[PDB]
Amino acid sequence: VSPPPPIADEPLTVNTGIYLIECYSLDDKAETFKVNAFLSLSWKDRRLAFDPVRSGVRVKTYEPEAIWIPEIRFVNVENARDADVVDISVSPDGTVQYLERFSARVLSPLDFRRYPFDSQTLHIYLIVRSVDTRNIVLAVDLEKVGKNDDVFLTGWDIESFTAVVKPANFALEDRLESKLDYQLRISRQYFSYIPNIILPMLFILFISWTAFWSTSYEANVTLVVSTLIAHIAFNILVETNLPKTPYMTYTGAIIFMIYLFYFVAVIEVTVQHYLKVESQPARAASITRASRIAFPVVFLLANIILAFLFFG
Amino acid sequence: VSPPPPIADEPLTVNTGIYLIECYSLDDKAETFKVNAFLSLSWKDRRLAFDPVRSGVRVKTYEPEAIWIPEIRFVNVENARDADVVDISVSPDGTVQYLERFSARVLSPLDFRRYPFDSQTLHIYLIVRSVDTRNIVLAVDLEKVGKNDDVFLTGWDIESFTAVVKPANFALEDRLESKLDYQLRISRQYFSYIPNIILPMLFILFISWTAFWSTSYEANVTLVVSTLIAHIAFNILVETNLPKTPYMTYTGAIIFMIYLFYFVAVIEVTVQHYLKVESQPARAASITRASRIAFPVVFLLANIILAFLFFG
Amino acid sequence: VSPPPPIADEPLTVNTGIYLIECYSLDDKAETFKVNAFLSLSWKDRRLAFDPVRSGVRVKTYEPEAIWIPEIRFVNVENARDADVVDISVSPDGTVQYLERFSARVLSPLDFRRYPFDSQTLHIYLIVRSVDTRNIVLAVDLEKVGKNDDVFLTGWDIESFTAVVKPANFALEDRLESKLDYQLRISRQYFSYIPNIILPMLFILFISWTAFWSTSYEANVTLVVSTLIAHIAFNILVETNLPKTPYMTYTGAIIFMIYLFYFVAVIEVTVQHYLKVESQPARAASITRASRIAFPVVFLLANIILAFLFFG
Amino acid sequence: VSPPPPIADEPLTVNTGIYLIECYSLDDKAETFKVNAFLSLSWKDRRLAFDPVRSGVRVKTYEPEAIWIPEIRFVNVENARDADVVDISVSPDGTVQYLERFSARVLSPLDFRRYPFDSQTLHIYLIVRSVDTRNIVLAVDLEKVGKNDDVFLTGWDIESFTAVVKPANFALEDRLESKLDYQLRISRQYFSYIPNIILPMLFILFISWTAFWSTSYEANVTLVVSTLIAHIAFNILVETNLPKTPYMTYTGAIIFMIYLFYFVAVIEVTVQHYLKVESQPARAASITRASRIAFPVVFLLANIILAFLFFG
Amino acid sequence: VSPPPPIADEPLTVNTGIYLIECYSLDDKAETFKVNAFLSLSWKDRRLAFDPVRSGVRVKTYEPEAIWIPEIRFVNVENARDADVVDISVSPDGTVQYLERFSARVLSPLDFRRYPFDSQTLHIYLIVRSVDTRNIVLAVDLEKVGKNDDVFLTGWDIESFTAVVKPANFALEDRLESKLDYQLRISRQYFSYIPNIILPMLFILFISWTAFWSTSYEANVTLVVSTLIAHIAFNILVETNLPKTPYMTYTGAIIFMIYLFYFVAVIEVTVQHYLKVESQPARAASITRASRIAFPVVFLLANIILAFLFFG
């Protein structure tokens, strides 16, 4: 088949719409995610009507090798999509309707700062090949684009799914400047993360801090060092689900602060024991009474400062 | 070949039946599972008989490129199934029998709350393409649908395998409203999970609780903190088989409760030691006698409350 | 080409033989294993001789698209095998010889109870398609079936490789009842498992038991709890190679027994310390003298009972 | 189609240009990396003009099966690239422009010494097949080669992207000596590595060193050995992201030095305790006062020597 | 096309040569390795010259579908190789030159005893299909076979790359007895393994042995048991890179010996404490003085015996 011939130099407008079905496999190390969805195409096909007789008002059904199907390519994909044509129904007026299912892998960038309370935005880009009959300009219709409201992407909630028109902005472009940008906004559910991670760390830190009400040097050493070992083990456990991040993060800053606090506690215990051995009990008592109030207040202030710095 | 022509506007009814062979690879992180099974198709083929002579009562054998094979697509799959035609035998009356083997990947949602005692339900959806001769409506026959009763899906037991008819409920539909829903019910075998997980945790918790019959502060500290380290290590071991779950779970609630109990035990030991140092032995003795009864009763009540909350 | 026409209603007998080459990748979580082997086919081809002249006694060489190659399908495979025809030589008498190499994935069930001393049996099923000329019945010849005696499946030893005839036993069958069952028996080499796993656990348990010859409560607590931590760490190390098993196992029973023994030892130490504090040294001495003989004998008896229960 | 015939024995010069789009999946164990990019081809096509009429100054659009597309193969790839032709536009003058998108896997060597502060250089090699019309020599144009400046390769920064001409230097070559070498320079961002790895190790080492201000043998033993256990656990945590390296590395040297320092500290503590037991307190006091200054200075000098050795 | 006809019953000799390019992905669990290399073919093609005119001394260039390309199959591969023809140049004399690039997966057996100082030998087998014109016998030429001397297989060094002729030795053979065996010898670089594994284990063992110069039972117990825990953790760390080996190994024997030494040290400490409690200090002093010399000498002798046993 051949593309429709021009009529009055009117640009060929193709209305594109993506209907989401399933979103899954949000890989973080590879920064990829697999998507399975539909695709709706509807282009003007005047001067090439298919039996427009009023007595033949029945919807015309055709095959892929019957008329010119426009060629649309995805930019940020690893390979060509698996096209699965479902139905091709065209009204006798001339408007063609096309539906298919595809499952491709999309390359989109992900930022994991503000990890426990982050929001992501996925992008899908579409490019239509040029033709020798008349330039084709992509248009977005708000009726076909949408989602089934049953996306099984666990751990995230979908806020919106829109599409706009943007220039190609490619150094190798010649005439194509009508790419499409589909934006999907998701938000992470952070309810379980608090009891899963934050509270046990605070409990271990408080258990370590309980050494300021004691005097036995051996008991204090055992408490502090064993709590440090427990903290290291819990960090090893936490690192299993956390993705590899080659930049600073809120959780990493918190962990570093906890390490610093453990070091300061060790120093304080050593100083207290040294003073007690050197037989200056008044200074040791004053230091150990001051630390009980000094540590929690400084910890809270540092946490507030870090939260303000990382969340505006 | 071409689809059979209409006769008296009677809708073409296709009887579909899936015969399970092997179910395996129940991936939880991807929320997928691979299935290998048969597929039986039988559609009315009147006015296109194949030598209906009584002397030719022998069963007719044909090839895939001999007659019109109906096109059936799966909705919740990553890609097209691997069709492997086994036999195509049609009686001289006109009824056609079709059998094939396929191995596709199915996308079905899985809930892991009530994890150790959960029950899952897998869904498979079928859609038949429309044709220009007469609308095709899917029908389910109870004879062909079934299982070999030798499914090697370890860790689960199959209760039933039924199929019903449901509307398409798609925003892009035009006339298709005859999707099929195959429901597979499975139940997890929880016998080994008790000795594998629950009992060692209780043993470690009781070992930690054995510190209420002692008076040595160093011994109590060693017991409690080392049992905390052992609990963390056992949690790390348990997390290997548990799937990633971005929501609350019964096991997670139990683990959080155990952490809270460890923290409370540390606080109680510290208070007892502080009282003994401050030379008020009566209060310390009363507290340490009360705790022996207080801890197990509160633990049992909390476990009962959690079980009632998570299991209706 | 076309299948040979019938002569005197004699069923077409096809002699099948599988020659193993390489067996590898015995996946346990997926319960699969990849096999690379040969395949020998020899069927009667009378009335379709290929130059049976005595002066042309030279062996005839043909291509896959020269004569009718029988179609054989594997039942317990994920997808169609990769057929690689090596040679097709047919004698002038009429007997055809066919050889090819394939590498498919086989789905076979594996039982891991009696794990360290278990024996497995792999099954491969073959089905021949029916034809419209004369029913084909599969036959097994003992000359072509065999192995190269150089199977590189490490950790296992091959005992036998036989094949028998069994009914199809399928609910969807029509006339096919001549499936083939190839049985491969393997045995696990358990020599290294003893020094790799069993002996260190016994050493740690004995180190824990060395606390019955001491009196220091702090030393006994340290010994027992630190040995418990070491046991947990060693269990974590062991779990790396052990496959996921959703049912009871000999090793799991042994580990549970070890946990129970640790708990009993903790209870005994606590009771001894409580008696010593309450100033009844005779009873404590009697208990600590009795335990030294009680623990090893009970451990040995329990191990004997478990071995008898799990090994008939 | 056929390649253009020669005119005046002038070698056919093909201008090649690669436009990067996405670089990702820098696998270290396999020493591979996947690249998705464009490819620009422009070759002289005189004597085969495509309607050079001035009134037909419109850009000519063709298909892959319209003219001779030069064949270019990649040397260091696992398999053939996935060619995805985007547009083929040729001016009426005779110059042809070709654009396509490919996603292949490149085999390039990676050196991980100087790991935290290393710089890598990736290579891509191109070879053009010989033809029977006239020898083809590859040329590099500086306009088409480039990058989109939006490479999402996290953890690295791109410095330059150039290309040069080099001899084939193959033992099997006959006449081809015009391979192309595309060099991509990247640098690792080392900011987060310092707080993620280096500082906690120093904190643990200092905590271990705090035992020189004490006299309790049990407390010193507990401190040193528990810090050794914590160091081993932290090394286990660090090894998760570090790639497998079968040669010496800066981090490995640092870890070995830390182990040696722990051993020396254990020896010093044992010697001090032995002297105190043997009742020579002056020597023990002198040794424990000297060690406080000896250890940090030696550690700093050793670190400086290692840094100078590994960084010129 | 058709194979060349026979001339004087002279066997067709094909000179084969493999030129290595990249060797990588030496998987140990699967016992496989991927290889990317060239392949040179040169067979006698007399009586089918391609314009042998002296004025046409120019090298003839052809396509794969121009002449008979001999069929060569690999025996120990999972699937057919990815053939990528580079150039087909034939001199007017009659000798044909063929070059291509392939990337297949090879199944070769690997022995990991003597692991840290082992040497491997990889094998590649080639089989040529028989033809009905004249028997083909494979020959090896020493000029085309070779390597680029730039193999990026890290951790190994290539010593030689030769090829010989061997009989097929297959039970299903008919006339083919001319298989080719390509042997690749590699040696592991063991420099980094010593500081990465061996020395920390010796340091931990010596730290454990430092308990023979002390008398505090609690300190000795803490030292020995905590060093045992550290040894278990280090073994867990080591097991990450070590491949799964279902047979005895030098490293496994060393680890078992270390466990036995830890057990003996625990027994000695317990005996010394029991004697001191029973008030026989002379015997305890004699035992603890003897052990200091007994342990290192026995350890060295056992290591020497193990090395002699495992290395001839």
Author numbering:
A (entry chain C), B (entry chain D), C (entry chain E), D (entry chain B), E (entry chain A): 5 to 316
Please share text taken word for word from the publication where this structure appeared.
Gloeobacter violaceus proton-gated ion channel (GLIC), a prokaryotic model of pLGICs, is particularly well-suited to stabilize preactive states under suboptimal activating conditions modulated by pH. The GLIC homomer consists of five subunits, each with an ECD and TMD. GLIC is activated by the protonation of a series of titratable residues in the ECD, leading to counterclockwise rotation and contraction of the ECD. Therefore, we established a data processing strategy involving symmetry expansion, backtracking particles, supervised particle reorientation, and 3D reconstruction to resolve high-resolution maps of various asymmetric intermediate states of nanodisc-reconstituted GLIC at pH 4.0, which provide comprehensive understanding of activation mechanism of GLIC.
Similarly, two symmetric maps with configurations of iiiii (or i5) and ooooo (or o5) were reconstructed using C5 symmetry with resolution of 2.96 and 2.85 Å, respectively. The i5 and o5 configurations were also reconstructed by applying C1 symmetry, which showed marginally reduced resolution compared to imposed C5 symmetry. Structural comparison showed that GLIC in i5 and o5 conformations resembles the previously resolved preopen C1 and open O states, with RMSDCα of 0.64 Å and 0.18 Å, respectively. Additionally, the positions of annular lipids observed in i5 and o5 states are consistent with those observed in C1 and O states. The pore radius of the o5 state is wider than that of i5 which agrees with the previous comparison between the O and C1 states of GLIC. Notably, among all the structures resolved at pH 4.0, the unexpected presence of the i5 state suggests that activation begins with a symmetric rotation of the ECD from resting state, which is followed by the onset of asymmetric rotation. This finding is consistent with the previous observation where a fast transition to the preopen intermediate state followed by slower and localized transition for channel opening has been proposed.
